[PDB]
Design an enzyme around this catalytic site. Structure first.
Site, mmCIF file in Angstrom:
data_model
loop_
_atom_site.group_PDB
_atom_site.id
_atom_site.type_symbol
_atom_site.label_atom_id
_atom_site.label_comp_id
_atom_site.label_asym_id
_atom_site.label_seq_id
_atom_site.Cartn_x
_atom_site.Cartn_y
_atom_site.Cartn_z
ATOM 1 N N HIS A 1 -10.371 21.192 -57.708
ATOM 2 C CA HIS A 1 -11.039 20.872 -57.657
ATOM 3 C C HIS A 1 -12.228 21.421 -58.585
ATOM 4 O O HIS A 1 -12.916 21.887 -58.712
ATOM 5 C CB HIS A 1 -12.238 20.912 -56.553
ATOM 6 C CG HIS A 1 -11.745 20.070 -55.480
ATOM 7 N ND1 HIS A 1 -12.019 18.488 -55.468
ATOM 8 C CD2 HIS A 1 -10.706 19.825 -54.703
ATOM 9 C CE1 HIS A 1 -11.504 18.233 -54.471
ATOM 10 N NE2 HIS A 1 -10.004 19.284 -53.934
ATOM 11 N N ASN B 1 -14.135 14.196 -49.392
ATOM 12 C CA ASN B 1 -13.548 13.135 -50.975
ATOM 13 C C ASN B 1 -13.648 12.030 -50.523
ATOM 14 O O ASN B 1 -14.985 11.258 -50.413
ATOM 15 C CB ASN B 1 -11.496 13.271 -50.594
ATOM 16 C CG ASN B 1 -11.122 14.381 -50.931
ATOM 17 O OD1 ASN B 1 -11.118 15.408 -51.869
ATOM 18 N ND2 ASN B 1 -10.190 15.168 -50.584
#
Ligand code: HEM
Ligand code: HEM
Ligand code: HEM
Lengths: 722, 722, 305, 83, 84
Positions: free
Chosen positions: A100, A173
């Site tokens: 990420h 997510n």
């Protein structure tokens, strides 16, 4: 003199004596305030009228030259101003996040609709008057700091709640499941999907050998592969995707009652996605598309808005499903357990400094608050140790909570001391129990809010072993497949076929479609054909999973079934050149504005164009620098001279061909059809709106747009050369 | 018990009970303040009435137990409270300073007596009404953290001036010169003096082969070696030593004229030192002697006070000396160029947290301010690079100026951004020149205080060569020798002899002793004799240097020829047991307080003793816990029972013998002389005051103490078993 | 000429035409094992070599910075000066948060008989194998440069380099510890370490906060007795006992578990200083145990346990 | 920059960065020190007969070319650059 | 908390016991806050009364009758001493 001046100290002014540029949040939305932002004001720097100084406070007279042994001589070691400026620059970079790395941040607030005392003692979920501040970072997964936004990936969604009883981090997510079941496999999965270690190829893509090799050998990954292969993997905006904490958590109430919980975020602006060809082109002409979209939407007032939802399960119903609720490769179908919308979150202020706020923010799933607890989900259990561990290297040590964006807004006294970059200066006893300070700060009893772990029974043997109940790899992939509209199924086949196309070793592709035959025979056959694989008779007879608690489909797992398309805040291209019809633009704009839609005039050059009525009208940018893939739909007003120049322009004729192939709505007023008719484009279908009156053509245009994409056009779009 | 079980369950009740211990400066002397301490107030947090919390603000309910599976089971990974607490502990340590690791700090303020506008534009030297905050760190050089205070070493003396035109660092030592002439030799010098690389022996000592190996091969070190071999190398206290910036700096006034400058600190409490045997015993029984002495000075109001002085040399006089003023192994004799006292610094507040303030402070010689400039001292020039470079790894990155103790008290806007642990949040343009922010912050013209370098001429060729004007290694060591009293010379011989006695390789001892024959023949002879070396008659007539600019000696290089002995703030042991004369103690105490001396009552046990008059007297500590090396002089009141107890106590009798051999003053009242007469000590000399009336005796005792030590006793005392 | 010689490049010999302590490879080169042989790949031998930068460039003059004239300003282009200074600036790493003060030596371990009945551990199977060890001895409270003969627990850490993994036996010289649950370690260590306002005292538990913590936590009393005894001040790392403190398990080839505690029993006996003597040693030789260990190995009086 | 990018002053010990020739000197320690040195760590020493040793310029020791340097200490852009 | 401190104390020779007393007495004598010395000396009354009495004397603490009558721990699996 003009030239000499530029290489001498600059004591004079330099300022001259859509429409406006992106600016720091403190400059554009200063009236959007919360408690965390007010705390951050303590660290903001206002440089108007200030001297340029060294970090020790010394005024600098000449920022243009090193100290030399003469004007043409050798640079002197005693030039401390040069060395301090260069040294700071030399150490600007800190490690990117191991996953990420690529992310976008904004400030906002959250309100609970009504108290949830029935379920949880968590302070921020008790009182609907409170505006508890939040900071959110959206992200991709695979790519490094400078990779593109609109890759095919999972999107991370991390919300930090600055509550009065502790900072709570909801780190999830944009798909309800993850790839793997036990945290011990995370380096293996991540290594497989990341660039390969010999050549570091490819960036921001799972479309390579090691990833699909791993999938093919770990069937537990297949469910979330389906999600990434679908149009979920390429959302249109962070405002139009869903969010999930994925793990089953626990909520404990004032009575000590435990409820299992799964977190949801539902977009008020609906759930919309790009298509693959349009996503890939967008990474060429704007790798910052999502980051820019989020920033501008906040400066425009189309604040991202999400409703926090909860799936709630009594502790006794833990085993009522055909899957383990502790299995992070399993979703809980919204039919079986509805999602209760419990509060709203609004994002309404951009950061002032990306690095200070977005890059340095630290989120850990282990940052819970009294009233929430962990489940024995063995992936969540590993995450608790990883977040804090990695932040010590990424952020410089154990005092990263003292970094402004990471501080709580409540007190936080304890006996911890020292470490790198220690900010606080603590005068009191540093051990507990002590008498020399009468044991302050003191432990808090549970009835006064001290954290306790819910006393869950624990039985078994010390063992490394995957629970029997986790061994179900194919049922939820099938549920997801059968729940997709026809066009969404085709797009899933597209993702699989394109991705496996880039795989070099044939046996990896064969092993992957073989895994697909245990999900759906026609999904496997479609993908096998696109790859030249002939399925055996045995493969075609491979057993398929039955329903899940009597469920074979679930409409909620589909994007384009339940008409989750919002029109407010969409973007429309308006293809105009010099000689356009003034009154048309006005009536297009007034119609679009009526619906919350932003129209952007794109012309061959920048600045202004003059209409056939002789007035000047501001352009938003060139046709060349803003291809159709950046807008939701195209409209071409009339004006014989406008149309004539557009027809000589390769970019503007391609603008409509590409808009067409990407299934978008195209409006053509008057002789604008002159331009459509010139291209190799079929007869106007349901997403081609012609008309001579602008307000009517706009009103009908805005109503084609409500369907997001003309899915019908898909078959004829393939054959169009463009 | 029920109390037993209580200790290992959460502690929710009070622990306190329903002459004083050392305390943070905020608790002890809150009245003593300045602008820097008010700034640091923002980073101080009070724990009274506050809950124990995690760094995320979560109340802890049980600080006594790990989360486990069962009360006798395995510890669980989800115990985020345990892992955070242990992780912070795990990362407490930062690298110590590469030199001067062992140090102690204090806060204070500085005021200039009258404007120095004739010589400099430096802001903090213009205005006597201004109170400039300072922070000062004193240190040894060689030892690590945890090494002892009263080793024989150079003392570092670093002063941070937080001025309104930038932070100014005067980073000095307690001797007017340094060991080497060129910065490129510093790692060699330091490696030679430090513990040896194979066994990391010896700690806190230069008395080992590699150090004297380097000396014998590098004669330029001989001048500072004489300083540290003398009693200057074992100061009594950081409040009673001199300080020197050593290098020649420059001062630039408003008219652009340049004066060569050397910085001095003169202690108002005098210059006094321990003797070697005493210093070494003190490292054994109180390795924290100087750190404690400073802390307790400030708490007792005996504030460290020093006058900042300048030797001032007009530019055109630079080459009028028999040495190079740019040579850091050369001092400028105060007879030639006097020290002008220009201001005063008072240290009046201990820190609250040693690590936050004393460990994390960062000083560099390059942190100068407008009005001051560098010279071409080639040692100074290399120092400018070193201080910032070491701090980037020692303090965690390039934002160590944002640590509270290092922040300036003035503004410091620039275009630097990011780096590890970035506190500031900036919104504006991060480049210069810019127009999008009208070029703020802006460069300052020199007439507005912009820093400029004085335009010194530079002529020559790029080369690595020692300036011929630096090759002069024995002049100043001889000058220093001839300026010492015979007692000081004896101690210099002792330092050399003791140190070289611990060198194993005999040729190192022989080569050092040969270097001494070029400084002074008696010195060489005396050291040779103590080392069993025989000098040839050739060596005894090695050529010796002559006078420097007409001086063979300079009394200001001597400590005891001078008269700088201050009686106020000294310490006195009063040896007493039960049955002591209590009126005598009261009168001794009253007399000592009259002269600002501190008497401490040392008995065979703590608590109280009982006067022969039946009164209780509170004791300061045990005789065994507080040997004579900890105090400046000793006085034994009367009371035949006390004297008879003390006569059965080996430590009490050693107290007198030891204090006698360390040339300290001893008072004995009446029967107390019975104790002295039983010891194998000669007839009372000038340092042994005997008398019957307590106050009368205490007065004469205080007068003897005015001479620091009884130098006449030295030879008598060598014979004594003790 | 001799004077000037010392501030000009030294291209000549400096050595002259009862014995000092020396690196292990110079005094005991015949004492070897598999680990030491592996370390040999990282030993530099500098005899007859040029002085060089870290990139391999020969250095002609190690005595002078690069300046504009022999009396001028140092130039930023002196890469040699800045490389040498920079490496010096960055020599130090953080000390251990506890047991900062320590002493190390190489050796070997042999098992007397196979322990197959109790454990499958490779290094306790075959008596003919010499398992290389490296041992570090330490105090607990003090920082890197604190004295040796303080009153303290001594740490005793042994690294066994076995053919089936590196095994670490990380123990003390008393058979018990001060606390029961790890959550209290930062409190215990903070209470014993120098106090936070003044960083006093070094290498001593004789101060308020430590005994404050003892007084409120009686679980500490057992190990407090050990360190108030003459166990707290040993004569030599060769004459103390060692313990792992914790109960471990040992599993044999049949899957059978035994509870285990580890012990080191010194062949040179158990002997300690007395308090007054230990304190005086810290003054006149803060390196006493470190030196004693180095020197005993150099004399052949090898520590054996 | 490389001290922080690559973790300290010993990044020349990372394989790709090591020279293929000798590189003895008196530098010691730093983070992740791989070399193990037994000899004297200061120059000049006599306990190792001053090895490793400075190299004369005629035997390959680096020297700077003695370029003339004349001017005043100055922060200024050369007029020969204004073009 | 007290059983094994007492076992360890009863195993020491009289000179080793004297040195334990000196260890406590010297260390506690550098503690400033008197209640800390007292609380620690109190803790010793639960280990052995003569140990507590010696250290309390060295620190000028007078022990109360409740303290000299504080309950002591018994043998550990039959052992009161262990000469190892
Ligand atoms: C349920 C599946 C998972 C989800 C939804 C998830 C979600 C995320 C998200 C959104 C981030 C980015 C946070 C940010 O913006 O700073 C992230 C970062 C990270 N995750 Fe995960 N993750 C999962 C599983 C794992 C596992 C199994 C591990 C390893 C044990 C792991 C370790 C990390 C690490 C080390 C980071 C970087 C943190 C930082 O540098 O600040 N995650 N995760
Ligand atoms: C005139 C001779 C010198 C004096 C008086 C001097 C003085 C000092 C002092 C007092 C300190 C301790 C500062 C503190 O309390 O934090 C110190 C530290 C230091 N000095 Fe020097 N020094 C001298 C020469 C050198 C040289 C030649 C170098 C190398 C080029 C050097 C490099 C350093 C370094 C790296 C530190 C540690 C700085 C830190 O970690 O904050 N010094 N010096
Ligand atoms: C049974 C009681 C314990 C014993 C015998 C013990 C023993 C030791 C020893 C001998 C060392 C020094 C190792 C070396 O030479 O490098 C050490 C270091 C250390 N111990 Fe302990 N310890 C104990 C309890 C704890 C606890 C409870 C913690 C915290 C959870 C802890 C954390 C540490 C840490 C962080 C180090 C420094 C390690 C390093 O920097 O390399 N120990 N321990």
């Amino acid at each position: 003199n003009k030239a000499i001046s530029t290489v001498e100290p600059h004591y004079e002014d330099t300022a001259p004596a859509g429409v406006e540029p992106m600016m720091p949040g403190s400059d554009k939305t200063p009236k959007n305030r919360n408690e965390k932002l007010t705390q951050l004001d303590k660290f903001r720097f206002a440089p108007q009228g200030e001297s340029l100084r060294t970090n020790q406070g010394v005024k600098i007279s000449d920022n243009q030259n090193s100290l030399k042994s003469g004007a043409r001589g050798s640079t002197l070691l005693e030039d401390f101003i040069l060395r301090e400026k260069i040294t700071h620059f030399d150490h600007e970079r800190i490690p990117e996040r191991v996953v990420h790395a690529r992310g976008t941040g904004a400030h906002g607030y959250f309100q609970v609709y009504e108290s949830l005392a029935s379920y949880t003692t968590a302070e921020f979920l008790q009182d609907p008057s409170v505006k508890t501040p939040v900071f959110v970072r959206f992200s991709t997964v695979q790519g490094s700091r400078g990779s593109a936004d609109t890759v095919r990936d999972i999107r991370g969604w991390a919300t930090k709640f600055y509550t009065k009883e502790g900072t709570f981090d909801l780190v999830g997510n944009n798909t309800p499941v993850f790839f793997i079941q036990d945290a011990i496999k995370f380096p293996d999965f991540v290594h497989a999907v990341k660039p390969e270690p010999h050549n570091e190829i490819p960036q921001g893509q799972s479309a390579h050998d090691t990833f699909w090799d791993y999938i093919s050998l770990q069937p537990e990954t297949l469910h979330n592969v389906m999600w990434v292969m679908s149009d979920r993997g390429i959302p249109r905006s962070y405002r139009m995707m869903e969010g999930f904490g994925i793990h089953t958590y626990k909520m404990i109430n004032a009575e000590g009652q435990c409820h299992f919980i799964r977190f949801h975020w539902k977009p008020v602006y609906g759930v919309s996605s790009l298509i693959w060809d349009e996503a890939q082109l967008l990474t060429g002409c704007d790798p910052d598309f999502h980051r820019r979209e989020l920033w501008e939407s906040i400066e425009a007032g189309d604040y991202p808005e999400y409703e926090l939802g909860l799936q709630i399960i009594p502790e006794e119903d833990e085993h009522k499903f055909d899957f383990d609720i502790l299995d992070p490769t399993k979703l809980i179908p919204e039919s079986l357990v509805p999602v209760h919308l419990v509060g709203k979150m609004v994002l309404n202020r951009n950061p002032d400094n990306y690095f200070s706020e977005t890059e340095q923010v630290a989120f850990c799933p282990g940052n819970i608050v009294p009233g929430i607890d962990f489940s024995d989900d063995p992936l969540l259990q590993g995450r608790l140790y990883s977040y804090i561990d990695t932040q010590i290297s990424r952020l410089g040590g154990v005092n990263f909570h003292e970094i402004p964006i990471n501080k709580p807004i409540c007190p936080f006294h304890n006996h911890q001391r020292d470490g790198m970059h220690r900010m606080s200066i603590s005068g009191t006893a540093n051990y507990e129990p002590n008498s020399i300070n009468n044991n302050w700060p003191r432990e808090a009893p549970p009835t006064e809010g001290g954290f306790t772990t819910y006393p869950q029974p624990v039985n078994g043997y010390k063992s490394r072993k995957r629970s029997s109940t986790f061994i179900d790899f194919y049922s939820q992939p099938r549920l997801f497949w059968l729940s997709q509209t026809k066009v969404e199924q085709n797009h899933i086949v597209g993702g699989f076929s394109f991705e496996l196309g880039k795989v070099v070793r044939p046996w990896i592709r064969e092993r992957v479609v073989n895994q697909l035959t245990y999900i759906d025979h026609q999904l496997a056959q479609s993908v096998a054909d696109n790859l030249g694989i002939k399925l055996s008779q045995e493969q075609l007879k491979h057993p398929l999973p039955g329903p899940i608690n009597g469920l074979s489909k679930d409409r909620s797992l589909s994007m384009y079934d339940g008409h989750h398309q919002i029109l407010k805040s969409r973007q429309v291209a308006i293809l105009a050149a010099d000689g356009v019809c003034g009154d048309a633009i006005d009536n297009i704009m007034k119609t679009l504005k009526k619906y919350g839609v932003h129209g952007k005039i794109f012309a061959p050059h920048v600045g202004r164009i003059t209409s056939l009525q002789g007035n000047e009208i501001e352009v938003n940018g060139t046709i060349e620098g803003n291809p159709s893939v950046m807008v939701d739909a195209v409209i071409i007003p009339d004006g014989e001279d406008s149309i004539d120049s557009l027809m000589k322009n390769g970019n503007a004729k391609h603008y409509v061909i590409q808009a067409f192939k990407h299934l978008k709505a195209i409006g053509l007023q008057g002789k604008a059809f002159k331009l459509y008719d010139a291209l190799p484009l079929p007869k106007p279908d349901e997403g081609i709106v012609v008309g001579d009156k602008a307000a009517d053509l706009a009103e009908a245009f805005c109503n084609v747009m409500r369907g997001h994409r003309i899915w019908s056009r898909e078959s004829v779009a393939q054959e169009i050369a463009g």
